[PDB]
Amino acid sequence: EGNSVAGIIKSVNETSGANLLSSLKTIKAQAAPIYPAAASSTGYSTQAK
Amino acid sequence: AKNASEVSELLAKSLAEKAVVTEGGKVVEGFSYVSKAVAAKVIATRRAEVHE
């Protein structure tokens, strides 16, 4: 996993001037940190029991 | 017949865009000039790709 600034720098450099502002929220969300989703419950683990 | 006015203009423009430069009555063949609309597109595509 390379860092997201070099992903921002690359994915802005390989973008034409016509589709630039259309594609910024793609690059904004592709370089977001992962905040993992609230999964299914599976309550009361082995050590919790 | 009713498009013959358009036949004449393309005869003129093909001779107009293939125009030769005369200095003293005689032509200077092998003379290359760059227009002020050609050079204004070289400025405009360079002002576009630096603004990008």
UniProtKB/TrEMBL annotation, chain A:
Give the highest taxon in the source lineage: Eukaryota
Q: What is this protein called?
A: Mitochondrial ATP synthase subunit ASA6
Q: What organism is recorded for this protein?
A: Polytomella sp. Pringsheim 198.80
| Taxonomic lineage from the root | Eukaryota, Viridiplantae, Chlorophyta, core chlorophytes, Chlorophyceae
What fragment of the whole protein does this chain represent? 28 to 76 of 151
From TrEMBL, chain B:
Q: What is this protein called?
A: ATP synthase associated protein ASA1
